[PDB]
Structure 1
Amino acid sequence: NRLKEKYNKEIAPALMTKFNYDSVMQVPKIEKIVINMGVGDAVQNAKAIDSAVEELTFIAGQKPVVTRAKKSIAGFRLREGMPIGAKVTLRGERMYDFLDKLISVSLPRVRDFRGVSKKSFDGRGNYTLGIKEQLIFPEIDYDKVTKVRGMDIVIVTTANTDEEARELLTQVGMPF
């Protein structure tokens, strides 16, 4: 919200001038911020996913969906039909409300921090985070936490190449 208004006011004009897009609305934009959860279950502990779901709901703004595994694999003893992982999508005002928490408090609150992954990009503007702890905002009832597994986080943009997204994330406020 705050960020978004700022996105309308300062970010889009600045980088539109910096790249010379003839059409203004061609400017890159964050499309979605999506969360994935994965629990080594195959089932290892049936309560693991049944805990991760309603901790991730607090972490995000709304309930996730339990991911239905695609195909069976005996390497992990993962039979097809035993649920693993959970997903929640975020967009609209919610994605900016989420990025707000992240950039302002979460990354600086990591057990240790330096500049985020230098070349985590995929190649076409998408970009991913691997954060190991659930310490995202400090008011989680953090004493509840038994397992320490953090989040897999993907930010998806309308960028067509890595350079523009790299530049955009700067004034969005991500360190590198």
Structure 2
Amino acid sequence: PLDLALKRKYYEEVRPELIRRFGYQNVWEVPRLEKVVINQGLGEAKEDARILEKAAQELALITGQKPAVTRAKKSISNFKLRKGMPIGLRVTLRRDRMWIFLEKLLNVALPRIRDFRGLNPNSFDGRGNYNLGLREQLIFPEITYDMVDALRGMDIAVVTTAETDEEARALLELLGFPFRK
């Protein structure tokens, strides 16, 4: 595996601080990062130019991983939705790629957000997972203003082995997640 600043920071500075702060008895009992699933809810490309390959290209550039499609589980009248119609994207990032993307997200992305005042503290799962949203894709460094055609945000779900929101917030803020409160 690759040598990364964020993974090394975890194993070096975040592990012992956590063990001290909570008093874990086992090495595995400590909270670890499990996965980070990114999902462009899209749905704007139902009809119109359903060719959403620009958005999937953007995701493949930001994550270094080609996303997959998501389709409708049912047809919906008001949403102009036919069952089985491609309406979104979802890429599951784990391990080294997860660390890479989280590094670039914490060091570049979250700063470049318009009127950024921190991440919402109450956005925790209750089981020890966190979620957030993004209004644009220009936030990430791999996306410039020329190669973009339309603004399209995304959803980020970070899944942690922690059991309470307390341990999860500890791990995430220690890793460098900026919380507004």
TM range (shorter): over 0.9
Question: Which residue is 2:57 aligned to?
Answer: 54
Provide the rounded CA distance (Å) in 1 between the counterparts of 2:113 and 2:61.
Answer: 18
Q: Cα 1:139–1:88, aligned 2, differ >3 Å: closer, same or farther?
A: closer
**1:1-176 maps to which residues of 2 (within 5 A)?**
1-41=4-44, 43-176=46-179
The structure with the greater share of residues assigned to helix is: 1
In structure 2, the gaps of 5 or more residues are none
TM-score, normalising length: structure 2:
0.91
Aligned-partner Cα distance in 1 for 2:146–2:50: 18
Pairwise CA RMSD of aligned residues? 1.5
Aligned pair count reads 176
Bigger shift: residues 67-76 or 39-48: 39-48
Q: Distance in 2 between matches of 1:49 and 1:125?
A: 33
Q: Is the 8 A contact 2:138 2:144 kept in 1?
A: no
Report the CA distance shift for 1:164/1:37 in structure 2 as closer, same or farther (over 3 A): same
Cα separation, partners in 2 of 1:42 and 1:150, compared to 1, 3 Å: closer
Aligned residues of 2:61 and 2:142 also touching (Cα < 8 A): no
* Deviation, structure 1 residue 120: 0.3
Task: Classify the secondary structure of the residue corresponding to 1:143.
Answer: coil
**CA–CA separation in structure 2 for the residues paired with 1:50 and 1:128:** 25
How many angstroms does 1:43 deviate by?
Answer: 2.1
Task: Give, in angstroms, the shift of residue 163 of structure 1.
Answer: 0.6
After TM superposition, the score normalised by the length of structure 1 is 0.93
Runs of at least 4 residues off by over 6 Å: none
2:83 is matched by which residue type in structure 1? E
Q: Where does the alignment leave 5 or more consecutive residues of structure 1 unmatched? A: none
Deviates more, 1:57-66 or 1:42-51: 42-51
Q: Secondary structure of 1:109's match?
A: coil
User: Structure 2: which amino acid aligns with 1:53?
Assistant: A
Deviations 1:43-71 (A, max 9, x none): 23233523211121112111000112211
